[PDB]
Structure formats: C-alpha cells, structure tokens
A paper describes a structure:
The pathway starts with the extracellular decomposition of β-1,3-xylan by two β-1,3-xylanases into β-1,3-xylooligomers, which are mainly internalized by an ATP-binding cassette transporter. The substrate binding protein of this transporter has an L-shaped substrate binding pocket to preferentially bind β-1,3-xylooligomers. XylC comprises two domains (domains I and II) with the substrate bound between the two domains, similar to other SBPs of [name] transporters.
To reveal the mechanism by which XylC preferentially binds β-1,3-XOs, the crystal structures of XylC in complex with β-1,3X2, β-1,3X3, and β-1,4X2, separately, were solved. The three structures are highly similar with root mean square deviations (RMSDs) of 0.18 ~ 0.23 Å. The binding pocket of XylC is L-shaped. In β-1,4-XO-binding proteins, however, the pockets are arc-shaped to accommodate the nearly linear β-1,4-XOs. In the structure of XylC-β-1,4X2, a ~ 45° deviation of xylose 2 was indeed observed compared to that in XylC-β-1,3X3 and XylC-β-1,3X2. The deviation results in the absence or increased distances of hydrogen bonds to Asn68, Trp91, and Asn314, which explains the poor binding affinities of XylC to β-1,4X2. Among all the tested XOs, XylC displayed the highest affinity to β-1,3X4 with a Kd (dissociation constant) value of 1.0 μM, but no binding to β-1,4X4. Its binding affinities to β-1,3X2 and β-1,3X3 were 5.5 times and 29.9 times that of β-1,4X2 and β-1,4X3, respectively, and no binding was detected to xylose.
Author numbering: 27 to 426
Write the structure that this text describes.
C-alpha cells in the first residue's frame, strides 16, 4: 500500500464531505492506494509552502494558483513532470486548464477550478438604500451607490484588509478597466513605463477616490478574509468584492450558517471606467489546481485523474462550490449565480489571473502592500505604481 499526500486550503464542510466521498470511492476501487488530505489555511499555506516544498515533509500534491510562483518552482526543480502519466487527465480536463499547469512541455500539475472575482451584494440592504443593483454599470454609478449606502447608515463594503489581497482586487480591476489587456501585457514585457504607466497610476487614483468615501467597515485593516466574509454573511455590510467561492463561505462564516440567502443576494461584474480601454466582460480570477512536488509518486496521478473526473467535478459544481474544469461537468452548474458566472468566464476575451499570483510572491506582495497603502494614505498612486514597476524589473532580471 502507498499513500498519496495532498495539501489543500479547503475549509467548507460540505466540500470536504464530497472530497471524502470521492476519496472513499477511489480507495475502494484502488485497494493499494490511500489518500491523505492535509489542510493548511490560505495565508498559512502560502507562508509555509516554500519551507515544506524544499524539505522532506513535501507532499505529493499541493494546491496551486499557477502563475509566477509555479513557474519559479518548476525552474528550480521543485516539481515533478508527470507528462508520462497524464493521458487520462488530458482526455477529461479542459485544454486551457491543463496548459495552465504545463511548462516547457512538462506537466507539473492539473487544474481543479476556474473562478471570477466580482461584487457580491445584498439586495435587501440595497433596497433599503434605494439602489437598483442591476443598474450599476460604471464606476461613477458604483461610487454613487456607496454614498447612498452611507446615507442609509449601512456599511457599504466588507474587506479583509489584514490579508491585503482582498484589497488588491480593487487596484487590479481598476488597472484592468483603465488600461485594458494591452496595458497589462506591455507591463509584463517591461515595455514603456511598465507598471508605472498611466493605467496603473489611474488605478491608484480611483482606489484613493473610493477610499476617500470611507466605504469600509471600521477597523478593516485588522480583519482577515474570514472576518470580512462573516460581516457580509451577517448583513453588516452591503458589498463584498470576492471570488465566486465566497457564495458558500459567507454562509459558513455567518452566525446563522446561512448568510445572505438567495432571495437577498446579488452578483455584479466589476463596472467599466469612463475613458478606460478595458471591457466590462474582462474578468479577474484564476485557474487553480494541484501541482506535483518533486518526487511525486505515480499513484498521485492515479488519484488526481479520479478526483478531477467528470463525476467528481459535477458533484462539486452541484454543491455550488466550483466552476469545474472537467469536460461535461458544467451540467452540474444548476445554481443561478454560478451558472451566470461560468458564462461570464467562458465569454471573456481577457481572463486575467490575480495580479498577486501572476507576478509571484515578491512583486505580488508589493501589489498587495500598495493596495492597502493607497487606501491608508501611506503611498501616493504614483509612488505605488513606481514600486510595482521597480520590483517587477528586478524579478525579470533575476529569473530565466
Ligand atoms: O493570493 C490570493 C489567494 O490567497 C486567494 O485564494 C483564495 C482564498 O479564498 C479561498 O480560500 C479560495 O479557495 C482561495 O483560492 O485567491 C486570490 C489571490 O489573490
């Protein structure tokens, strides 16, 4: 018997119940393979993984956002090429999802889900404030809704400022809307002014404008994502900019374990910015998966091809958790919120991975730092963009 060790960041009890049913079914069909799930919370996982991956504690499989850290881990010899064990994965999973975890023709992981960041909002609170949530198409209209919420005594936005990345969603989306795909593509290539260019300075200017309305809950810089999602679930703030995984999370984090029920819940895309080059259909989000650590056993690919199969992924869509990557598993997207989100993802010409993950731990950490820094007044919009560009130039210099 051999044990496949899979490190993950999942907290939801319904999801874990489904994962356990899949693992039980797999172990019954493969009596010589055991599956050990190893949980670490999101922030702890990102902080601890570098040490664990470079040690003899490394697992076979670990949760991954792809992006810059995945690229560097591959070039550092920290991952295992499973191309020779990928025949079934390539049959059953989306080609774009498989490509997200392939480097230099080597299959270093497999996709698990795709996501969109957007504004979850409370229709009950919006009605109290006299806001039609479906009518918010532009950034100016969004700011007007913020002012209407404040006038009604309702905290407009819950944000997990302590974790920083929830605030970076604002800066990133504003940069996407201001500059469009080409401004970002050019910055990635270090062309022109790069991340110090006008679209990124405008992103900071618009984030500072939002911050000047004081739209966040008191003490937001001390709140992590769990606390912020709980505020939304408890009807204590009207708006939550978050990935689509928030749907189940705000319910679990609510005192009543239900949160904002479907009859009170809305979701809207990030609005357009007047004069901006970005399209309202452009999406910020991710393609997340499981990477193979160096030394991963062949049984780990056997597990992943079952865990990621059409039936398994259909179950996880049907419990409202993931937008799946397995072919045909979109049949499980029965929930109206998740169905519409999956359509936005499918239709997007530009589906951009989270800036903090695309740019790697160092430069992405700078983006996270300047996002809260602009809001708190510690850096100006120009200085923020300058810091991102300077850090990015050094990352380019020091990597292949
Ligand atoms: O760096 C952050 C990631 O930490 C964040 O990951 C999310 C966190 O919320 C849930 O735990 C979800 O399962 C994770 O994938 O994703 C956005 C990125 O900017």
């Amino acid at each position: 018997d051999t044990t496949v060790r899979m490190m993950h960041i999942e907290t939801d009890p319904n999801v874990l119940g489904v994962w356990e049913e899949i693992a039980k079914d797999f172990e019954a069909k493969n009596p010589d393979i055991k599956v050990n799930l190893e949980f670490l919370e999101n922030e702890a996982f990102k902080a601890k993984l570098p040490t664990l991956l470079q040690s003899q504690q490394k697992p076979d499989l670990f949760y991954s956002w792809g992006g810059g850290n995945f690229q560097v881990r591959a070039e550092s010899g920290l991952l295992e090429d499973m191309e020779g064990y990928s025949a079934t994965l390539n049959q059953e999973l989306s080609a774009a999802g498989m490509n997200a975890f392939k480097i230099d023709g080597k299959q270093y992981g497999a996709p698990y889900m795709v996501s969109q960041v957007g504004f979850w909002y409370n229709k009950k609170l919006f009605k109290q404030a006299g806001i039609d949530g479906e009518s918010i198409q532009t950034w100016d209209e969004f700011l007007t809704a913020i002012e209407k919420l404040k006038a009604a005594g309702i905290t407009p936005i819950a944000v997990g400022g302590a974790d920083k990345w929830p605030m970076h969603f604002y800066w990133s989306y504003l940069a996407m809307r201001a500059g469009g795909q080409e401004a970002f593509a050019a910055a990635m290539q270090d062309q022109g002014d790069g991340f110090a260019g006008e679209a990124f300075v405008r992103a900071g200017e618009e984030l500072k404008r939002l911050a000047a309305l004081e739209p966040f809950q008191p003490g937001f810089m001390a709140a992590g994502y769990g606390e912020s999602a709980g505020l939304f679930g408890d009807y204590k703030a009207a708006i939550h900019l978050m990935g689509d995984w928030d749907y189940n999370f705000q319910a679990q984090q609510a005192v009543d374990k239900k949160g904002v029920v479907d009859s009170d819940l809305g979701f809207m895309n990030f609005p357009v910015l007047k004069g901006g080059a970005g399209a309202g259909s452009d999406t910020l989000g991710g393609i997340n998966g499981f990477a193979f650590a160096k030394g991963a056993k062949p049984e780990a690919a056997k597990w992943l091809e079952f865990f990621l199969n059409e039936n398994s992924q259909t179950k996880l869509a049907e419990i409202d958790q993931i937008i799946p990557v397995a072919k045909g598993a979109d049949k499980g997207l029965k929930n109206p919120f998740k169905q519409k989100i999956s359509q936005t993802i499918s239709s997007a010409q530009w589906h951009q991975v989270f800036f903090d993950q695309a740019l790697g731990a160092d430069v992405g950490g700078v983006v996270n730092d300047i996002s809260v820094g602009i809001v708190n007044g510690d850096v100006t919009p120009k200085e923020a963009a300058e810091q991102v560009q300077e850090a990015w130039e050094m990352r380019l210099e020091h990597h292949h």
